[PDB]
Amino acid sequence: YAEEKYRKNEKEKKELEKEIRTQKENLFKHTQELFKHREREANLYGEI
Amino acid sequence: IEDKSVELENLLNEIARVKIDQLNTLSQIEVLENKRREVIKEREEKEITV
């Protein structure tokens, strides 16, 4: 039973790692889109 | 696991922030481009008058 618990805890750690990577990549790609649109914002400011 | 989950929560909150920013910026883009179109219309109206 002890070895069962240890393996299960390792699995939970790995799943948390996976979800954390999901969140980091979501954040970064959204930030990149934001930077592109901020560039567009400065461009449209110049346009007006 | 504890440390991992803390950082997971932080990343989720950051993503939510950034998406809300996307929405706000899109509404702002709506309004500003409306104004730009009106302004340019008036620009070429001034050209007509010139």
UniProtKB/TrEMBL annotation, chain A:
Superkingdom as given in the UniProt entry: Eukaryota
Q: Under what name is this protein listed?
A: Flagella associated protein
- Of the intact sequence, the residues represented are 435 to 482 of 963
UniProtKB/TrEMBL annotation, chain B:
User: Which residues does UniProt call coiled coil?
Assistant: 1-49
Lineage, top-rank taxon, reads Eukaryota
> What is the name attached to this protein's record?
Coiled-coil protein, putative
Q: Which residues of the full protein are shown?
A: 398 to 447 of 893
